[PDB]
Symmetry: C2
């Protein structure tokens, strides 16, 4: 698998024998926020 990065466009492609496999945008998280990983309250109480 060969992966090419386009830094300016924040784009990547994963190719296997010159055929597209994955595509998207990958970039660094400048300011991580721990609050993002707080568990959302479940819609079902499930008390029992």
């Amino acid at each position: 698998l060969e992966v090419r990065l386009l830094e300016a466009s924040r784009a990547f492609e994963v190719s296997e024998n010159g055929n597209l496999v994955v595509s998207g945008k990958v970039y660094q998280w400048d300011d991580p926020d721990p609050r993002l990983f707080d568990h959302p309250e479940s819609p079902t109480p499930n008390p029992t």
Copy 2:
């Protein structure tokens, strides 16, 4: 200027000092058709 190609996605990218300037798609024209260059029906048939 830096030109990067993504053959699988047929996408190119031009950048200057890391700032994207041009983006788009490019690929070899497999079967050119000379009909594509016949001059189109003129908007004004008889300018006279």
